Design a protein around this motif. Structure first.
Motif, PDB file in Angstrom:
ATOM      1  N   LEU A 159       0.826  -1.192   0.000  1.00  0.00           N
ATOM      2  CA  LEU A 159       0.000   0.000   0.000  1.00  0.00           C
ATOM      3  C   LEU A 159       0.871   1.257   0.000  1.00  0.00           C
ATOM      4  N   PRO A 160       0.342   2.374  -0.489  1.00  0.00           N
ATOM      5  CA  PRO A 160       1.133   3.608  -0.547  1.00  0.00           C
ATOM      6  C   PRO A 160       1.564   4.118   0.822  1.00  0.00           C
ATOM      7  N   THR A 161       2.696   4.820   0.829  1.00  0.00           N
ATOM      8  CA  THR A 161       3.247   5.490   2.009  1.00  0.00           C
ATOM      9  C   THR A 161       3.519   6.937   1.608  1.00  0.00           C
ATOM     10  N   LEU A 162       2.822   7.879   2.231  1.00  0.00           N
ATOM     11  CA  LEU A 162       2.809   9.263   1.772  1.00  0.00           C
ATOM     12  C   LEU A 162       3.268  10.216   2.866  1.00  0.00           C
ATOM     13  N   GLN A 163       3.714  11.392   2.425  1.00  0.00           N
ATOM     14  CA  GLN A 163       4.113  12.459   3.329  1.00  0.00           C
ATOM     15  C   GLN A 163       2.930  12.924   4.169  1.00  0.00           C
ATOM     16  N   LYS A 164       3.250  13.531   5.313  1.00  0.00           N
ATOM     17  CA  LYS A 164       2.213  13.914   6.263  1.00  0.00           C
ATOM     18  C   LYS A 164       1.352  15.062   5.749  1.00  0.00           C
ATOM     19  N   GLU A 165       1.878  15.890   4.847  1.00  0.00           N
ATOM     20  CA  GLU A 165       1.104  17.040   4.397  1.00  0.00           C
ATOM     21  C   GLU A 165       0.131  16.676   3.285  1.00  0.00           C
ATOM     22  N   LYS A 168      -4.451  13.610   3.609  1.00  0.00           N
ATOM     23  CA  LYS A 168      -5.618  14.444   3.875  1.00  0.00           C
ATOM     24  C   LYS A 168      -6.798  13.605   4.354  1.00  0.00           C
ATOM     25  N   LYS A 169      -7.669  14.210   5.169  1.00  0.00           N
ATOM     26  CA  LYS A 169      -8.672  13.447   5.901  1.00  0.00           C
ATOM     27  C   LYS A 169     -10.054  13.453   5.255  1.00  0.00           C
TER      28      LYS A 169
ATOM     29  N   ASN B  35      -0.707  21.766   8.641  1.00  0.00           N
ATOM     30  CA  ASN B  35      -0.826  20.522   9.394  1.00  0.00           C
ATOM     31  C   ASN B  35       0.501  19.790   9.555  1.00  0.00           C
ATOM     32  N   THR B  36       1.617  20.514   9.591  1.00  0.00           N
ATOM     33  CA  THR B  36       2.892  19.949  10.013  1.00  0.00           C
ATOM     34  C   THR B  36       3.567  20.928  10.955  1.00  0.00           C
ATOM     35  N   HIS B  39       5.623  23.726   9.020  1.00  0.00           N
ATOM     36  CA  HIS B  39       4.881  24.808   8.383  1.00  0.00           C
ATOM     37  C   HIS B  39       4.277  25.763   9.404  1.00  0.00           C
TER      38      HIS B  39
ATOM     39  N   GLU D  32       8.348   8.615  -2.566  1.00  0.00           N
ATOM     40  CA  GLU D  32       7.153   9.171  -1.955  1.00  0.00           C
ATOM     41  C   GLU D  32       7.299   9.565  -0.493  1.00  0.00           C
ATOM     42  N   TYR D  33       8.111   8.864   0.292  1.00  0.00           N
ATOM     43  CA  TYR D  33       8.213   9.166   1.712  1.00  0.00           C
ATOM     44  C   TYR D  33       9.671   9.306   2.117  1.00  0.00           C
ATOM     45  N   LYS D  70       8.724  -0.085   0.414  1.00  0.00           N
ATOM     46  CA  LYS D  70       7.378   0.455   0.558  1.00  0.00           C
ATOM     47  C   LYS D  70       7.318   1.968   0.403  1.00  0.00           C
ATOM     48  N   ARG D  71       8.449   2.655   0.253  1.00  0.00           N
ATOM     49  CA  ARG D  71       8.466   4.100   0.078  1.00  0.00           C
ATOM     50  C   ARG D  71       8.412   4.514  -1.387  1.00  0.00           C
TER      51      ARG D  71
ATOM     52  N   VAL E 118     -15.476  11.006   1.575  1.00  0.00           N
ATOM     53  CA  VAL E 118     -15.072   9.777   2.243  1.00  0.00           C
ATOM     54  C   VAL E 118     -13.833  10.054   3.083  1.00  0.00           C
ATOM     55  N   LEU E 119     -13.511   9.109   3.963  1.00  0.00           N
ATOM     56  CA  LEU E 119     -12.343   9.225   4.835  1.00  0.00           C
ATOM     57  C   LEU E 119     -11.416   8.045   4.598  1.00  0.00           C
ATOM     58  N   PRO E 120     -10.370   8.190   3.784  1.00  0.00           N
ATOM     59  CA  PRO E 120      -9.538   7.025   3.448  1.00  0.00           C
ATOM     60  C   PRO E 120      -8.837   6.399   4.639  1.00  0.00           C
TER      61      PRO E 120
END
Ligand SMILES: [Mg+2]
Ligand SMILES: [Mg+2]
Ligand SMILES: [Mg+2]
Ligand SMILES: [Mg+2]
Ligand SMILES: [Mg+2]
Ligand SMILES: [Mg+2]
Lengths: 180, 105, 186, 148, 201
Positions: A159-165, A168-169, B35-36, B39, D32-33, D70-71, E118-120
């Motif tokens: 599964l993807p691993t993304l930056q914290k910014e 999004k929720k 949200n970091t 920032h 990506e990370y 995984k990154r 939605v909320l992923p």
RNA sequence: CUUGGAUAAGGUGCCUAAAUAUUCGCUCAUGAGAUCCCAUAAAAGGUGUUGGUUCAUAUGAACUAGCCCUGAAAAUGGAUGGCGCUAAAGCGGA
């Protein structure tokens, strides 16, 4: 350069002897190779083994060297085999394992994690014997044989691993795990 | 089409607290697009205005303001700690504030 | 341990039309069409229409998961055999003193069982969709149950057998009932 | 042997498999990370199921390093590189193949570059874009009116 | 969380993860409307969750059951109760937070013509490995006496038909506007066209 | 008696200030599990699954110990603190 990925294990080479006396005025000299977190811990393990195996206590001995061996080809991939001895809840056993890495302490880091995960063995109950390098024709464990074929390919199914910014929720379209 | 904006929107959370204790000298704010932790540091000197309404007239008008400052961050997610000249009342804990951009750099 | 790759190959017979899209399978032949879904186990399967051989392949898998490949392959073989030559289960009904009487109604469905251990009552079973019940033309006390789907035909054969179980006597001595005696094809 | 006719040939080029984009020496891998986020690279070697050695030649800002698999995000492009290449040969190969510059022409590369361009715009440039849109609106609305 | 109202459809979400993300939003101050609550998912076998509801059913005030735990069993009231247990609903502020949540089964009018989010971080597809067992909330609540599972499905069929017709008309409109846009680009001074092209508009 | 800074013990899914953080393993329970004092569980078993040792030409055995399971019965309706949690928010590490 990325400290989120570092282990804190290094290798050291320690030399020591006993303080000369009149009954013994040119005593035996000893060397070991120890994996630890820093040089102070390596000296602590060295004196522990000096006491357990020979009759040396730190109080009547002296230290001759502490080197911190480095590794020569940190981007070539090797095969490693390790010999162990550890204590269970009801007895003591000794084991042989195999790892794939680009450094010896990189393999020791994996070994501690695996022995904690599979047997609930703590670092305080593990003694390490004889790390070395093994040729590819003499590998025994099946999970290492899988990795040394002629043309190794496989898809990426994680599964993807993304930056914290970008994490999004409230999304506006439900995402996909396929990613081809 | 009139009354330009010139600030970023915010929402006032509660006080700086633990479980079971309060410490009302500082207050926690959320900023809309931030949200970091890294920032949030961008805003660490700006002036903060809290505008609300009353029912009687006080100096000819029915609007008054409490002034504050952005002092530091609050850890990994873009909340900030702010300090005001008087203490914000607790009957404001979801209301709106203006993170201005006056002390420009 | 996780294995990297694992595969198995299944030939396609002559008079069969096959289709698989999202792990959903349809096969056709002389005696009807069969549907089946497999969207509960992680596989990607590959159909070669120019030749034969559907193929099943699974990436990183454990012994528990790797055991499902041959299961799917056998199911595919079963439904290939089904559409070209129907399945057949033969049954024999047995008695010691009171003879058992059967009667088939409603277009060769719905057998009716009378006089089991002399009871004056009547017992009914109804065939599963796509099954036909008929009595042998050769021997005295045999039934034929058959047609195109191993699951439904075996379940009908077992439903008939559970309908004449004997209550509180010694079943080692009281041996009356209906029992499956041969599994074959038409 | 007997070789394969055209029939079999295109037939091979018609089976669209579910899985493309395998991990191997040559894949493109947007990152990506982590600290090197938003950059391109190449697989040169794989250590285990989860760990991979990754290298973006001196064209891209990533050095040769080990990375958790995984990154990464596999891309459509692959270069056909050799047994145990080093960075120097990889630079020559990526230069003589023109793979980075034709990733730039794809759907994702174009939008990445356009976003970058939009990020360093100045205040006068933003006004220019606003003004151009205001002008285009008038032609939209006269053509629409003439239509009905 | 800087909007007048967010509409969520709960189809495919896990109950606890979704309920934990709604409650913090409500506490920070934000109206939330949740629709299609009958499609919520839970992360055990159906039998196992029915056992848990059976245990919930057998606790009551011994001397007078009119008081005590009230066993609500519509699929939306269940989300309402699970959210209520993540809030301090016995203070004035925490009771205000609870009143800002609206829950529906199906998709009634005011919201069938709004935009759903939605909320992923709570989707079953991204959180639960594929060999684990799970159940659907509507089936579970029908097994304990809800009785309206069929009617909402019948209604959703018609809603989706009307939505399909709307979507057809919208796609036609966007095509007819794109052609007008591409024609009008040639009637503009070259500087505006060049600056529009440089930034990809 | 105060203003500001930075910690200890312990924690970072919501209740509740701070990670739905990163990086390795293990586990599916038709009465899972969740850390001093502390708020109970044994002998004996398992063809559940994961590692290891020793024998016999690629199968047959014999042992060993991690999680899970059987052994496991009480009186008003109830308690890992509650909700809940299985790409953990569980157990052993970094
Ligand atoms: Mg009796
Ligand atoms: Mg203080
Ligand atoms: Mg908080
Ligand atoms: Mg034997
Ligand atoms: Mg607790
Ligand atoms: Mg907790």
């Amino acid at each position: 350069i990325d400290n989120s990925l570092n282990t804190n294990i290094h290798q050291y080479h320690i030399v020591g002897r006993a303080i000369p006396t009149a009954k013994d005025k040119n005593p035996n000299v000893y060397r070991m190779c120890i994996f630890a977190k820093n040089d102070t811990n390596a000296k602590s393990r060295f004196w522990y083994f000096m006491k357990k195996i020979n009759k040396l206590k730190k109080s009547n001995g002296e230290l001759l060297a502490c080197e911190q061996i480095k590794e020569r080809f940190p981007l070539r991939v090797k095969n490693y085999g390790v010999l162990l001895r550890y204590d269970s809840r009801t007895g003591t056993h000794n084991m042989y394992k195999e790892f794939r890495d680009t450094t010896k302490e990189g393999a020791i880091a994996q070994l501690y994690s695996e022995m904690a995960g599979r047997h609930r063995a703590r670092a305080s109950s593990i003694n390490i014997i004889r790390i070395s390098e093994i040729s590819s024709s003499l590998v025994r464990r099946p999970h290492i044989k899988q990795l040394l074929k002629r043309r190794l390919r496989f898809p990426a199914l994680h599964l993807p691993t993304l930056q914290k910014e970008y994490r999004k929720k409230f999304a506006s379209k439900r995402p996909s795990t396929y990613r081809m | 089409l009139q009354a330009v904006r010139l600030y970023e929107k915010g929402v006032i959370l509660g006080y700086k607290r633990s479980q079971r204790n309060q410490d009302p000298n500082f207050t926690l704010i959320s900023i809309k697009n931030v949200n970091t932790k890294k920032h949030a540091q961008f805003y660490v000197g700006k002036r903060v205005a809290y505008v609300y309404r009353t029912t009687k007239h006080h100096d000819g008008v029915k609007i008054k303001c409490i002034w504050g400052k952005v002092c530091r961050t609050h850890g990994n997610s873009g909340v900030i700690r702010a300090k005001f000249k008087t203490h914000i009342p607790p009957k404001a804990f979801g209301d709106r504030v203006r993170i201005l951009m006056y002390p420009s750099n | 341990m996780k294995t990297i790759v694992s595969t198995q190959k299944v030939l396609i017979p002559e008079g069969v039309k096959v289709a698989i899209n999202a792990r959903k399978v349809t096969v056709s032949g002389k005696y009807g069409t069969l549907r089946r879904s497999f969207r509960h186990l992680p596989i990607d399967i590959r159909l070669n229409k120019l030749k034969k051989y559907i193929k099943v392949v699974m990436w990183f898998g454990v012994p528990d998961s790797l055991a499902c490949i041959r299961t799917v392959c056998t199911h595919l073989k079963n439904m290939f055999t089904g559409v070209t030559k129907k399945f057949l289960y033969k049954m024999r009904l047995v008695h010691a003193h009171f003879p058992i009487n059967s009667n088939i109604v409603d277009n060769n469905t719905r057998i009716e069982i009378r006089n089991y251990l002399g009871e004056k009552s009547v017992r009914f079973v109804k065939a599963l969709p796509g099954v036909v019940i008929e009595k042998s033309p050769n021997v005295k006390d045999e039934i034929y149950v058959s047609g195109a789907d191993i699951e439904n035909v075996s379940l009908t054969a077992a439903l008939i057998h559970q309908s004449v179980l004997c209550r509180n006597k010694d079943i080692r001595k009281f041996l009356d009932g209906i029992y499956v005696s041969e599994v074959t094809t038409v | 042997r007997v070789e394969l006719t055209e029939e079999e040939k295109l037939y091979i080029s018609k089976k669209n498999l579910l899985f493309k984009r395998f991990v191997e020496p040559g894949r493109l891998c947007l990152i990506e990370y982590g600290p090197y986020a938003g950059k391109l690279c190449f697989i040169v070697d794989i250590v285990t199921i989860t760990r991979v050695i990754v290298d973006g030649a001196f064209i891209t800002g990533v050095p040769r390093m080990v990375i958790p698999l995984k990154r990464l995000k596999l891309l459509k492009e692959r270069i056909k590189i050799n047994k145990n290449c080093k960075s120097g040969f990889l630079r020559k190969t990526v230069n003589s193949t023109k793979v980075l510059e034709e990733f730039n022409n794809s759907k994702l590369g174009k939008k990445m570059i356009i976003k970058k361009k939009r990020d360093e715009a100045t205040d006068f440039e933003r006004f220019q874009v606003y003004f151009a849109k205001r002008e285009l609106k008038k032609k939209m609305t006269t053509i629409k009116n003439k239509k009905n | 969380m800087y909007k007048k109202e967010y509409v969520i459809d709960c189809k495919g979400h896990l109950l606890g993860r979704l309920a934990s993300l709604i409650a913090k939003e409500l506490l920070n101050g934000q109206r939330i409307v949740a629709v299609r609550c009958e499609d919520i998912n839970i992360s055990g076998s159906l039998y196992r969750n029915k056992l848990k509801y059976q245990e919930f059913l057998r606790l009551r005030t011994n001397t007078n059951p009119k008081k005590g735990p009230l066993h609500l069993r519509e699929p939306s009231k269940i989300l309402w109760r699970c959210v209520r247990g993540m809030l301090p609903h016995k203070t004035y502020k925490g009771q205000l937070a609870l009143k800002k949540l609206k829950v529906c089964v199906g998709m009634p009018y005011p919201y069938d013509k709004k935009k759903k989010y939605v909320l992923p971080s709570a989707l079953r597809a991204f959180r639960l490995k594929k060999h684990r067992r799970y159940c659907r909330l509507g089936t579970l609540s029908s097994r304990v006496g809800w009785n309206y599972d069929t009617l909402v499905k019948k209604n959703e069929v018609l809603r989706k038909q009307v939505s399909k017709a709307y979507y057809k008309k919208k796609v036609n409109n966007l095509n007819e506007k794109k052609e007008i846009k591409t024609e009008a680009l040639n009637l503009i001074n070259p500087e505006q066209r060049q600056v529009l092209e440089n930034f990809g508009y």
